[PDB]
Design a binder for these strands. Structure first.
Ligand SMILES: [Mg+2]
Ligand SMILES: [Mg+2]
Ligand SMILES: [Mg+2]
Ligand SMILES: [Mg+2]
Lengths: 11, 143, 36, 69, 49, 38, 100, 134, 120, 62, 219, 31, 197
RNA sequence: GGAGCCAGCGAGUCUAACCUUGGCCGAGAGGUCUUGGUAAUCUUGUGAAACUCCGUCGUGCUGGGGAUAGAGCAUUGUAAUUAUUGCUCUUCAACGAGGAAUUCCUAGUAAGCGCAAGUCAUCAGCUUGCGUUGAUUACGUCCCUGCCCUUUC
């Protein structure tokens, strides 16, 4: 689970 | 968007191209939308599931933003999402269960709740207390 | 509320066999012109 | 959605209890209110007929309509 | 020939692929019997017909 | 390879200017071949 | 006993709520028709759902699957170049371009 | 003066098929339960037990209405769409239906071609018409 | 010979030939009773003359209808038209003309298509 | 309460917008009283129309 | 000279035309049929859904029509145009090549539907006069002298190019603007009878497999 | 003259054949 | 009555009087609103809807067509149902049966009450918008259209079929309850017209 | 999945092998032995489809969807293990009603459904014809747009 100021993963 | 590959037209990154289009590049800034959606979607009210965002593009494109979506915080990736959305008319989740961003048919009213109060932000209009207006507004209605 | 990442491509292209078929159609159209 | 696929004893009893009550009885009524599978709604309707709890008004293959006895 | 509909006919072994037929569309052709005919169009399936 | 029939005529520009010139020339004298009531 | 909401057949998770034929269809190599045939050979009532099945029925179905010929499943029933073509097309296009 | 035509088609077919399986004299080939009955069909007859007897009843009925019928016309009659181009039914099943019906004596090899309703078969069908009318 | 009349009914390509003779109220279509005509939903669409003019008129006569061409609905329309026209013709030929008058009156009052062909 | 009025004449040359017809209706309650109304669908003489308001006077809608 | 079938009616009774299409027309053919209606001043478009030719020709003949126009297409591309003159022919069939419809134009505008002036150019042979005579009588007689619309049929190697223009006379020259459509029509059948009668005698008929076909001229 | 001939209001793409043949025409001239 | 060809008992009761599907009588059905009287046609009784009558020839002939046929015709739409009038007749028969089952009152009068109630009495026309009165023929047409499309949309992706959802829509419309889809649009259109009054 | 079950336009073999009924074999595709027809005569009532009745399924990207792919059983040539057209099984994707915009349509009409012939242009799952089921809305206006007619004013 992502939270707060996380950016979506970059592949 | 415009083919150079399709790239979101930007105020600083692209100047000559928008001149060729004849559009005043001053009104060619999607970063304002990116930040506004960023500040919106990250607000606790979204985390409480009491908000829906609608985007009306200047061209006349209406976009529905599912509260579950998460735009990339980096502007460069945000542009990649927009060009993807505008051409495919929809964005699907990584898990492939729901369409987070969807283009929808105008007018806006049909999508809005049956009983809803409509207001705009006007610098010339009387200055109000946002909190006070929301309590005196009725409950079943939406803003 | 649930949070799900949006899926997208870094660069959008609007596999090779279809590309081969695509080149064929272009070749069909031109050669027909030359014959006519 | 989740509609019950099996006739349990507690599910058996309730079908007998309310099914006299409804003015209108059909496959749709059973699934909507009793959360029972469509096939089990059908087997119930042929079941409920043979004891006479419900009376048939018109029998069509797609649509079956019944009333309380 | 392998399939015949009165004047119209389908022919095989003349061309290896549809590549060739497009080049030779409308060409003058005739049978050994002397009946004249024409290359009307290339069949997509199979190649060369 | 020998061709059987007339190729379909193509309207390149020069054909267009020739036809337009013919039309303009005809209308200049009002040389119209038109049906008339009797 | 208790109805089985989920079952494990041939290393596959199968939902109990589905009819036996269309429940076995989820198995790789098993279609609607093959599922119907194996169910029939197993002498299992098709109107039953997957979870009402007794253990002997499940084992019989498994053996039917693993040994089809032994139980008379019909034989008719049971189940670089592209680069060269690309080069050829390239050569054809090159000659064509040379003509023009 | 009861007759097959005096009875509803579905009712007569069902009743006479019931009489067939109750009698148990109709020969069933081993493969009835493995076949499509047609190329266009996607799935076998759901009523695996009694579909054959129902087909036999239907064939006997059509033979009653029409004096002479062959395998081909039954194949067309029992055929349906699979664009869809009206694929014909399975010849083997109709042929075995005919052979079974003539083994019972319901039908017989018609001169001039096809099959003829046997007089014994005629009175039999009239009988089942009589009971189903009741 | 037995008194008899013959009439035709038509709609689209469907054509029905009705023979009406003296009889015992025996009505047949395609060799089968009127009660077995299909489709069932339009069964009563075949019944309009019988129920409109009363069955007692039919009880004294035999009617045989042979239908060919067109679809099921057009066949039903041809059948009903043939029954009506045959009944009217029979009362014309072998019954007094006043009865023919009431028959045509009822048929036209309900649906003119029963007597007059409606060609599209 | 909605009043009922019977059409007596269908006006022409009114310049009314397409799809709208100006008519004269006499009230069922009082025959003498007559009022000009605007109708949005197919209308003929002698038919009865429902008037939610009996006060407004019809004006050309361009 | 005006042909026998038209000599009776060539310019007293204005031609009344029905333009129609084949069964289940595509959208493009319907648009093309609309354009052909506008080309002919007295044309009325009739949707041919399940109509049958003997019924069509009979009903058309009972209504007193002079000419019937039926259009055929291939994947929304007009292919053939047949003109049949009542009460007893002739029937002329044409093949349409390089068809360009006015729907292909943005901001095109509306046509003028005045009685158009006619231009038939390079028609010399007897068959050519037949074609000109057939086409001429589709239009009204004696267009007004100042009518700004002109329809031209130009023969170039048996291929009749059809164009329409609207002209304005200027002090030093006249300027003409094409309104469209563009299409080249080649005759390939001519029969002495209505289109319904398949047994009608063939007045003229195009030989395509003849060795001189690649160079032979007819109109 | 140039303005009021849309086919050569502006025409939709692909209506004309001028570009396709002119290249071949000069090519045929070269051969 | 005895005949060589046996005839059912119900058929002689039909001989007694004309009834829709040999189960419902037209004698007691009355249009409640006076204005709608001459376009909601129920006076001539019929066994079955399917009539193949010509109703598009003249402008107001449609009024003489019986209302049940109009509903059946309106029931078949959206392409996949076009041309299947037999299915429409069967669905309407089942709908009448359902309406009678839910409410003992005559389903035909229920239909009449529903079409009367749901008819928009005032609408809007572009000039901005201006409020206009609606011709009663338009009232019946829009009422039928609203009811049919509502019954359809209710059961488009629901276990409910067309017959029972149509029966529910008709019952609610006759009741005047807001649960009915078409009543919501009748009220909305009238409110919009009132705003531009 | 069974059962009921109804059209019309046409085509079809001489110095040949076309339409093919019927019998038998084959799960099917198809094979095989006969038979009628140079045709209002035989194929053919072309027992078309959609459709109707009775059953199974059941709001689940599910028994909707059939793209892609694999393995087989056959036909056609031809001498290749070459393709070709059919059938069986398995595999089972996008798609949940479609943005800005845009095209067409008034009665046997829109729309759905199939059957036949490829008869010198065009057409090969495309052209034409044939038949089956069969609607909603309007049939009034020059208000807006556009095109005309008259003033032998
Ligand atoms: Mg259509
Ligand atoms: Mg079609
Ligand atoms: Mg076509
Ligand atoms: Mg008009």
């Amino acid at each position: 689970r992502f939270k707060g100021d996380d950016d979506i993963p970059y592949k | 968007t415009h083919k150079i590959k399709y790239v979101l037209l930007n105020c600083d990154d692209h100047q000559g191209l928008l001149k060729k289009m004849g559009r005043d590049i001053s009104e060619a800034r999607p970063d304002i939308t990116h930040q506004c959606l960023l500040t919106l979607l990250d607000s606790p009210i979204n985390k409480a599931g009491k908000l829906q965002v609608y985007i009306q593009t200047s061209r006349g494109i209406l976009i529905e933003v599912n509260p579950t979506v998460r735009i990339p915080r980096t502007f460069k990736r945000f542009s990649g999402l927009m060009v993807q959305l505008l051409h495919k008319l929809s964005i699907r989740s990584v898990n492939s269960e729901e369409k987070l961003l969807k283009v929808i048919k105008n007018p806006i009213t049909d999508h809005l709740p049956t009983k809803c109060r409509k207001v705009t932000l006007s610098f010339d209009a009387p200055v109000i207390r946002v909190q006070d207006y929301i309590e005196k507004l009725d409950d079943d209605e939406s803003i | 509320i649930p949070t799900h990442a949006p899926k997208y491509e870094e660069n959008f292209n609007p596999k090779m066999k279809a590309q081969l078929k695509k080149e064929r159609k272009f070749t069909m159209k031109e050669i027909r012109k030359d014959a006519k | 959605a989740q509609h019950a696929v099996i006739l349990d004893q507690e599910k058996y009893d309730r079908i007998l209890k309310e099914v006299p009550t409804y003015r209108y009885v059909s496959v749709s009524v059973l699934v909507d209110r009793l959360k029972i599978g469509g096939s089990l709604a059908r087997i119930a309707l042929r079941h409920l007929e043979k004891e006479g709890i419900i009376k048939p008004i018109s029998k069509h293959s797609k649509q079956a309509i019944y009333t309380r006895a | 020939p392998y399939k015949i509909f009165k004047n119209t006919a389908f022919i095989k072994d003349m061309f290896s692929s549809a590549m060739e037929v497009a080049r030779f569309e409308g060409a003058q052709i005739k049978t050994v019997s002397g009946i004249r005919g024409e290359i009307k169009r290339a069949l997509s399936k199979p190649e060369g017909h | 390879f020998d061709r059987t029939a007339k190729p379909v005529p193509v309207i390149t520009s020069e054909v267009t200017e020739s036809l337009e010139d013919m039309i303009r020339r005809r209308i200049q004298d009002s040389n119209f071949d038109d049906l008339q009531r009797r | 006993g208790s109805f089985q909401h989920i079952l494990r057949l041939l290393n596959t998770n199968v939902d109990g709520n589905i009819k036996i034929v269309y429940a076995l269809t989820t198995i790789k190599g098993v279609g609607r028709r093959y599922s119907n045939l194996v169910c029939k050979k197993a002498d299992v009532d098709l109107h039953k759902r997957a979870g009402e099945l007794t253990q002997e029925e499940l084992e019989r179905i498994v053996q039917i699957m693993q040994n089809p010929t032994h139980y008379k499943i019909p034989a008719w029933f049971l189940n670089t170049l592209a680069n060269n073509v690309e080069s050829k097309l390239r050569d054809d296009l090159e000659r064509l371009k040379k003509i023009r | 003066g009861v007759s097959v035509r005096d009875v509803a088609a579905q009712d007569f077919i069902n009743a006479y098929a019931s009489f067939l399986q109750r009698q148990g004299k109709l020969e069933v080939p081993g493969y009835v339960d493995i076949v499509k009955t047609s190329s266009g069909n996607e799935m076998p007859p759901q009523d695996a037990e009694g579909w054959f007897y129902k087909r036999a009843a239907s064939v006997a009925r059509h033979i009653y209405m029409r004096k002479q019928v062959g395998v081909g016309k039954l194949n067309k009659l029992y055929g349906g769409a699979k664009p869809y181009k009206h694929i014909d039914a399975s010849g083997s099943i109709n042929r075995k239906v005919l052979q079974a019906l003539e083994k019972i004596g319901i039908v017989e090899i018609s001169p001039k071609g096809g099959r003829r309703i046997s007089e014994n078969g005629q009175r039999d069908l009239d009988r089942i018409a009589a009971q189903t009318l009741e | 010979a037995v008194p008899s009349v013959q009439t035709f009914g038509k709609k689209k390509s469907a054509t029905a030939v009705a023979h009406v003779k003296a009889g015992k109220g025996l009505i047949k279509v395609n060799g089968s009773p009127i009660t077995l005509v299909e489709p069932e939903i339009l069964r009563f669409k075949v019944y309009e003359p019988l129920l409109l003019v009363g069955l007692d008129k039919f009880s004294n006569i035999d009617i045989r209808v042979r239908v060919t061409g067109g679809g099921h609905v057009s066949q039903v329309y041809a059948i009903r038209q043939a029954i009506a026209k045959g009944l009217v013709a029979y009362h014309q030929k072998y019954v007094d003309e006043q009865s023919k008058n009431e028959l045509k009156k009822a048929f036209t009052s309900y649906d003119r298509t029963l007597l007059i062909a409606d060609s599209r | 309460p909605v009043t009922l009025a019977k059409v007596i004449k269908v006006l022409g040359r009114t310049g009314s917008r397409g799809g709208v017809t100006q008519v004269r209706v006499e009230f069922l309650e009082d025959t003498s009283r007559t009022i000009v109304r605007n109708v949005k669908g197919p209308v003929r003489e002698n038919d009865i129309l429902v008037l939610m308001e009996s006060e407004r006077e019809a004006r050309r809608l361009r | 000279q005006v042909d026998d079938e038209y000599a009776a009616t060539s310019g007293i009774m204005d031609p009344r035309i029905i333009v129609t299409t084949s069964r289940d027309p595509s959208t493009r053919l319907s648009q093309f049929a609309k354009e052909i209606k506008l080309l002919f001043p007295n044309a009325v478009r009739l949707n041919r859904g399940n109509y049958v030719m003997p019924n069509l020709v009979d009903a058309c003949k009972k209504s007193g029509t002079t000419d019937l126009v039926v259009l055929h297409e291939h994947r929304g591309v007009p292919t053939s145009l047949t003109i049949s003159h009542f009460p007893h022919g002739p029937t002329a069939q044409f093949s349409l090549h390089n068809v360009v419809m006015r729907h292909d134009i943005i901001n095109a505008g509306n046509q003028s539907e005045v009685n158009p002036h006619l231009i038939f150019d390079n028609f010399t042979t007897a068959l050519g006069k037949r074609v000109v005579c057939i086409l001429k009588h589709l239009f009204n007689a004696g267009p007004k002298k100042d009518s700004e619309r002109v329809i031209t049929f130009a023969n170039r190697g048996d291929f009749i190019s059809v164009r329409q223009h609207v002209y304005v006379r200027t002090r030093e020259g006249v300027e003409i603007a094409e309104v469209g459509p563009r299409f080249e029509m080649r005759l390939f059948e001519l029969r002495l009878g209505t289109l319904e009668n398949k047994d009608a005698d063939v007045e003229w008929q195009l030989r395509r497999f003849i060795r001189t076909a690649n160079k032979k001229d007819y109109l | 003259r140039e303005e009021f001939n849309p086919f050569e209001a502006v025409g939709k793409p692909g209506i004309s054949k001028q570009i396709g043949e002119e290249q071949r025409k000069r090519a045929f001239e070269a051969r | 009555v005895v005949l060589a060809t046996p005839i059912p008992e119900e058929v002689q009761q039909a001989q007694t009087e004309i009834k829709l599907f040999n189960k419902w009588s037209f004698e007691e059905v009355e249009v409640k609103d006076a204005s709608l009287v001459d376009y909601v046609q129920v006076r001539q009784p019929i066994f079955v809807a399917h009539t193949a009558g010509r109703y598009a020839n003249k402008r107001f002939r449609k009024a003489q067509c019986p209302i049940i046929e109009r509903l059946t015709n309106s029931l078949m739409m959206n392409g996949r149902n076009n041309g299947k009038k037999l299915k429409a007749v069967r669905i309407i028969k089942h709908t009448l049966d359902i309406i009678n089952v839910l409410t003992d009152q005559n389903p035909i009068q229920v239909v009449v009450d529903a079409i009367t109630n749901t008819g928009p009495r005032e609408d809007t026309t572009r000039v901005r918008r201006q409020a206009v009165d609606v011709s009663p023929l338009r009232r019946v047409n829009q009422a039928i259209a609203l009811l049919t499309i509502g019954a359809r949309e209710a059961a488009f992706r629901n276990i409910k079929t067309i017959a029972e959802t149509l029966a529910e829509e008709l019952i609610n419309a006759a009741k005047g309850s807001s649960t009915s889809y078409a009543i919501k649009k009748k009220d909305e259109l009238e409110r919009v017209a009132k705003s531009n009054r």
